[PDB]
Design a protein around this ligand. Structure first.
Ligand SMILES: Nc1ncnc2c1ncn2[C@@H]1O[C@H](COP(=O)(O)OP(=O)(O)NP(=O)(O)O)[C@@H](O)[C@H]1O
Ligand SMILES: Nc1ncnc2c1ncn2[C@@H]1O[C@H](COP(=O)(O)OP(=O)(O)NP(=O)(O)O)[C@@H](O)[C@H]1O
Lengths: 486, 486, 234, 113, 113
DNA sequence: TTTTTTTTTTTTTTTTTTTTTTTT
DNA sequence: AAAAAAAAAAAAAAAAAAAAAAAA
């Protein structure tokens, strides 16, 4: 008859869910009705589309035009619906052969002259389009942003007539500019630029291999955030897909990285108090927060007890599943937050100790595997200049990569994410080691999860020593990283 | 078919984003349609533009008119969209040759007689136009404000007919007037009025010469606030590019400053009664706050134990990044906030003194580099008159001008902004210096931050002696200004 | 639809969720033409893809004294107060309890399915017919443990509908929170109200609580924090 | 609209010690002059001065020197004349109780009287 | 509305000893009747009075003589008639601490027994 | 060895800007 | 073809419940 289908994508949450644009024409008096929860920025696109179609020397149909943006449950805020609506209107009036619109997705604004203009936060659309294996058409102003993915099967155009020519006559035009240069870390910082703490350094290196969260205990003014800020150095380079996902997460916020930190794990340490709306998801049109940010990186947490209780209890979901499920009353949208957690805590500024320690949430203070006490540096070490022992981060990075490969070989998850049931099956335990653990529980009444936490850290230490299975010395070193002190 | 394009500037935050006005005429019913998120202040430009065009002996088209305002996602708030729309309507109707609108930007509010009216906050638009090398035409009422920049590519007009004549026959309009007939610095304020406080004045001298933040403590009624106020004169006069930015922020607020002091570094002390939105950011269309009003200047926080922590917890990020980002749920807005901190407090209002200090935010005091005490002024020295007329002023300002260049030659930041690693290799601590530093460290209870705080101010004092490295004499003086006692 | 005994016609895209109930009398369609053909002539639409362990009491040694008491509590539906010295948690006794209870019927399991479905991201694998066991964390939160806030979401107690609640170290908890757990025990549902209106989360379950009476003269203090009505219904 | 009665006698306004900061100084809404501005060119009396909250008393310093209070309603700011003359009455307390009582005063404001 | 009840017969209500101030009289949200507002024309059983909150027992003043507990949310005044009869029970309690025990009995309410 | 006040958070209210539905 | 009665949110202001902070 006189209806057509075109496919777009709208950035809701972090994932660009597919949006079906449906255009129908009927023999009524001329009109234009937009159906679907479209905001003003989209409802105003009627005149833009009419002018773009007319000024490109096409015939704008003088009939009842009905446009539906399915599905109808999701509000649509992106302004880049003009190009698909125009193509749908053209296809409905049989000015474009319909069979070529099946495998394409279109995103882009339209000025009244027919020239395309770019839209913001486009990278997630490209990611979704490739994931579904769909050709994507993009306004040429977005080629600079979209080329960072380096993804094929993405084309750009300048005018609506260019897109029409591509669809009908097949005169393919433009392609993503070539990928930018794959330069190197420019990482400065380095782990070498920290004076000798030794115990804290070794503990952090152990946890980086095992991906375990740590508590940075000790007196304030001792080097808590200073040591943490260098922890992201140890973590390995992210994969192509992981880097692309982090890039989309940052792109939705609006601050494009500088083409270099692409493969560097993020840090994004949140403020002291901040806001629970800001630090987890958001309201209005929902935007990612500090939790959603630093998806595959390391998240820092200074002055853990000070944080609001509701924030800490809502923080249970990520370390348990890696998703946030903030609801918008009508529905819910997911946020990926599978992050490494680093926390700092100061053992009180003796009556107040009970309430101060009790103020800290235990649901958070159960998955914090390791703890360490960061003693202040001796004046001799503070005043002594650093020999710098040449830069030392690539050796530790190589060690972490090898340990991660070893862990990936024996199961499909890291030791931090091991289930309680699989801990016994995976680990190779000797009889004397089991007897030693039984004797240890005589000395200290560790909880049920203490077993698995001690086993988890000792597994990384044992794999660190040379190979094979757990040993008495490994558990002996592990015992030092108990849950608390007092 | 004919349509016209016309460029203008709409200001959001501080920078004036480019906005392209598109006008298209169709053969439908005579209606006027405007799209592009028009705030109702500009949405009613239809009747104003219609009457302005009719009354200037032109011919208003009797056709359907569609007007599109730039990017479809940027709200338009200014009232100065009448002139671009009127010129677009004229150009689309072939009453103006289109080629002349190639590289011009128009800003101006029209009246029904055709006379142009001044629009508030014109300076950022002029700056943006000069950055892009574009002719800018404004109302005659804005000539006084636009003359600050002194750019030669800005023209002014009296009515729409003048603009049409300029675009059609090159009548050449009326250029903006020359720089105001004033050069005399004066400022009626200088360092001499502070009498008797030799030690604190000498310390504030080195505070200006290294960009260090300085904390002041002393008895009320002495020159604390006066020394803060006179501290502006010490800093070197701002460059033209910095003066334009400061004038842009000031004009955006609305307080047009006096031409006499448009190059002095701004000084603005916030008031204790202020919302966290008053100092930083703003509601509505975002407006610069108190902190950004002191860009490239000095911020004076008198009575530091006041200013409820809710206010001070927002000042953290600007002290490190030099800017603050405010989210409008649809875009991100940035405000320049690079400044120098000066704070004043009463040392004493028993163990209650600790509670008095407890209200202070430790991380804020972490960034402060210097502390001095305002001792009670001697009897006869104040009792003795001020017959001395040896006003220092220009001498110390000349000294700090060279001082900033000397620091800028070594690294890419002043002594206050040194990285911890860069504290060394710039201060070649000798054999005896380490000995003395070890002694003072052992006898005191300094932290890691305090040691590096001690090094930077000592570096600045070392430059004051035109010596390559510290000579154990600068360290002794540094201890006095250091020792952030409380 | 099941409660009223009514046929459902549902979009084919929703067959992923409606199949998880394993229901009959629920159909799926693609077009209005298919539904019109069904109503006019009955063209036999699709009817969802039908759907086809844990520990036991054997893992515990011959503790006949407590085992038979627990069985009686399960048979009679009464609560229980497994408590004493905190010996290695002792929660392994409670974890076995959920296995003893009878298998839930269609509506009973389906109601828990809906209650979980509200929280979004429907539980991952399987096992809807097994009654839940979800237990608190000895500190919880008044919003999280009971009812909720913001646009309402079921609390921990409601999630344990037709299941078991293992509230450990009862004395510590919160005095205000404990009394909020009153209406569900008596009626079987909560009526938490806030702002505009309220909704009724069904909260029928069974309670298993633990306590420590300390090693002197501190037993009275350790029991002084107890809520009388909550213990009176045990 | 006082007319013919006191249009040449200096105003005398004595706000009650609680009042409200949005009425004592400036205000919201399309702004209406507050208590402080109502005493322009006149006398302002503050009985039981320490009883006033420190937040309000710290605002008194700006008009006492600059001569006019500058309201700060985020987007907009307006000027109100405040050239008044200040008169204050305080009770020298009814141990550390003396220090606690005198802490409720504003040291700069009292030391500027 | 639960069951078929009896309606024609006097009601009986007994608060949950510790109870709550919002449950005994009035309530939040749109005005909801309190426990004391219940048992209208009936019998209210107040068991173990000292366990109750002192302020609420003081708030029982008007209901037992006036029969109306009109709530005040600063927006509306809903009446909620509460005519009833009081019945209370006391434990003599386990001697100078007897005064401490009796100090919580809310003597103004004890006068109406 | 025994009891209270205050500040913060949350909740509500109010105003205004936004929205959403008249009435030509 | 321009408007005005109604549903939602952002910010300022005031009151109730909790925490703790400090006082006997
Ligand atoms: N182990 C350390 N090694 C080298 N430098 C350190 C070390 N600890 C502190 N520093 C110095 O500490 C200064 C800033 O780091 P730091 O004091 O840790 O800030 P912070 O992490 O925000 N607060 P805190 O951790 O409590 O001290 C730098 O000059 C560092 O050089
Ligand atoms: N050498 C001097 N030392 C101190 N005060 C001086 C000196 N010379 C003049 N003064 C005068 O004394 C006034 C003191 O100002 P100041 O004490 O800073 O008032 P303020 O703004 O309330 N800050 P504060 O110091 O806390 O009282 C100055 O405004 C000068 O008018």
């Amino acid at each position: 008859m006189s209806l057509a289908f075109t496919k777009t994508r709208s950035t809701i949450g972090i994932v660009a869910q597919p949006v079906s644009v449906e255009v129908h024409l009927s023999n009524g008096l001329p009109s234009f009705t937009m159906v679907g929860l479209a905001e003003t920025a989209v409802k105003e696109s009627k005149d833009r589309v009419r002018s773009a179609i007319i000024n490109s020397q096409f015939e704008f149909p003088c009939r009842k035009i009905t446009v539906n943006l399915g599905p109808a449950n999701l509000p649509k805020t992106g302004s880049g619906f003009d190009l698909p609506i125009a193509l749908g209107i053209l296809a409905a009036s049989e000015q474009i052969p319909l069979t070529n619109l099946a495998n394409h997705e279109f995103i882009g604004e339209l000025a009244l002259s027919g020239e395309l203009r770019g839209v913001s936060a486009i990278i997630p659309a490209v990611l979704a389009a490739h994931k579904d294996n769909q050709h994507l058409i993009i306004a040429n102003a977005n080629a600079a942003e979209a080329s960072l993915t380096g993804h094929q099967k993405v084309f750009t155009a300048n005018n609506l007539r260019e897109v029409c020519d591509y669809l009908c006559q097949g005169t393919s035009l433009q392609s993503l500019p070539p990928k930018p240069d794959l330069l190197l870390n420019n990482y400065e910082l380095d782990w070498s630029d920290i004076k000798g703490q030794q115990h804290a350094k070794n503990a952090m290196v152990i946890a980086a291999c095992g991906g375990h969260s740590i508590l940075l205990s000790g007196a304030p003014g001792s080097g808590k955030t200073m040591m943490a800020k260098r922890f992201s150095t140890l973590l390995p380079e992210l994969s192509e897909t992981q880097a692309l996902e982090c890039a989309a997460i940052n792109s939705i916020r609006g601050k494009l990285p500088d083409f270099r930190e692409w493969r560097l794990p993020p840090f994004r340490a949140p403020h002291h108090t901040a806001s629970p709306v800001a630090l987890v998801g958001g309201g209005n049109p929902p935007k990612p927060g500090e939790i959603s940010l630093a998806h595959h990186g390391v998240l820092f947490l200074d002055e853990l007890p000070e944080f609001n209780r509701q924030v800490l209890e809502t923080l249970r979901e990520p370390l348990e599943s890696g998703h946030i499920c903030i609801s918008r009353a009508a529905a819910q949208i997911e946020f990926p937050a599978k992050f490494q957690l680093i926390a700092a805590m100061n053992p009180c500024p003796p009556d107040r100790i009970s309430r101060y320690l009790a103020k800290l949430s235990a649901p958070l203070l159960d998955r914090i595997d390791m703890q360490v006490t960061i003693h202040a540096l001796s004046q001799e070490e503070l005043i002594k200049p650093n020999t710098h022992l040449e830069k030392q981060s690539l050796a530790i990075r190589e060690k972490v990569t090898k340990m991660h490969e070893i862990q990936m070989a024996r199961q499909d998850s890291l030791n931090a994410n091991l289930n309680s049931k699989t801990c016994e099956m995976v680990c190779e335990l000797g009889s004397e080691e089991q007897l030693f653990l039984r004797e240890v529980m005589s000395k200290l009444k560790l909880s049920a999860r203490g077993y698995h936490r001690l086993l988890k850290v000792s597994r990384t230490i044992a794999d660190m020593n040379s190979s094979k299975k757990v040993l008495l010395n490994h558990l002996q070193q592990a015992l030092s990283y108990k849950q608390n002190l007092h």
